[PDB]
Symmetry: D2
Subunit: 116 residues, 4 copies
Amino acid sequence: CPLMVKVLDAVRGSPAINVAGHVFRKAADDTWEPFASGKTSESGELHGLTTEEEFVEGIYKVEIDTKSYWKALGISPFHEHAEVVFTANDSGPRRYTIAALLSPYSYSTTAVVTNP
Amino acid sequence: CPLMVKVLDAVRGSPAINVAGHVFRKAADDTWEPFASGKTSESGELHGLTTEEEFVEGIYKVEIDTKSYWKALGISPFHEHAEVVFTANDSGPRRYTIAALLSPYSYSTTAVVTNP
Amino acid sequence: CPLMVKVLDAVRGSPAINVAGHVFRKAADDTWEPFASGKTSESGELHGLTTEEEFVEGIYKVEIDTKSYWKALGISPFHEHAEVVFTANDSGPRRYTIAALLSPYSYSTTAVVTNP
Amino acid sequence: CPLMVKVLDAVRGSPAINVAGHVFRKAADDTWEPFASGKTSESGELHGLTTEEEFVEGIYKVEIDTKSYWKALGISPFHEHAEVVFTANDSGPRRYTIAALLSPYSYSTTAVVTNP
Ligand SMILES: Cc1ccc(C(=O)c2cc(O)c(O)c([N+](=O)[O-])c2)cc1
Ligand SMILES: Cc1ccc(C(=O)c2cc(O)c(O)c([N+](=O)[O-])c2)cc1
């Protein structure tokens, strides 16, 4: 899996389960083309989004629906979502983990990029 | 100052100076309408973006040009930019500080929301 | 103010008010000698800890009583406290802001170091 | 493994490899007794620190030698180390992942605590 998304809850100290994630790729006309989507598992991880052959060079956007996560816990959070936009595979194929750490009024995101 | 943006550099341990930030309000057609912009000061701060009168309820986006910042420092960055999207003033007017802490492969954002 | 500590609450999106902070300097015997202390203000800030004269080179520790803060809010915390240990003034006197962003199961700390 | 430590580098977007970690447990006399140590693998993970039977209730300290990590990369970082202090197993045995995300002038730490 060349693209994985992991989401953690900094209030409970747990994986953030059942969080929707949507991936888009910038098209030649500069629009955001839907690329993949899913929801986080019990481990907070969203696997199986793409394959090495489909995950070509390009600019990708990962949008994590953090607002729905907090709202289901009774909380009205600050952010509408957490979005991560990045160029992928510019130097050849890589494996990307996009990790997000969520609090109601703050989030952090990191990328772990490895060479297979 | 109903809206302030502060940007910090976690590599140098300093304010992130001369970082462009652009503010948008979501339009009725779901498009992003540009609202205000500026460059961070020597303290990392972007002041004077809006006024109490103009900063009505709505969904707002702050886009921080983190890629140009890292490029100017000669450091390879992961993200194309950092975006913060939030609903403003849903329970009355508030003063918002959006703080962003930047590293080349990670960023975090927090909101400090105080009632005047 | 050679040394300032600022504490923010990522759950409420506010300064963390009335948080105790204690500052220590490492002694020749490697023990921690208490140096200064205070409680964060309504802006989350602990000012007036030390002076230019007293804040000589050395290794310093700031201990933030995060557990008492979360307990006062009725929220279960993970950490006993948050500690920040750093060598100060190794290349001349600097002004240090130690910023801590608190969640119940996570914290982050950053230093903003500026040369007067 | 009831206790795992994971360390990531936010500058390079990579696991932080070969980082020393030391674990201590608070003794009945209030001293810090050495409990386990190791170094992070190529995945940034330190496994095999303890067993469920040995990892009894108590207050534990995990000290990560972040300064040596940065110094080996040519960087003089702000922090001397990253230390995490927490009560473990107060409600029965749990599995703890202590994750640290490192930059030269900032770090963040989170706990992911799961029930086996
Ligand atoms: C680790 C971390 C991340 C974000 C914040 C943070 O949100 C913040 C907010 C401020 O109003 C402010 O003045 C500063 N500061 O000056 O350093 C930081 C504080 C700490
Ligand atoms: C404070 C912080 C923020 C983000 C990360 C982080 O990026 C990360 C990445 C992983 O692949 C991973 O498995 C975990 N984890 O399980 O805890 C965390 C690590 C620490």
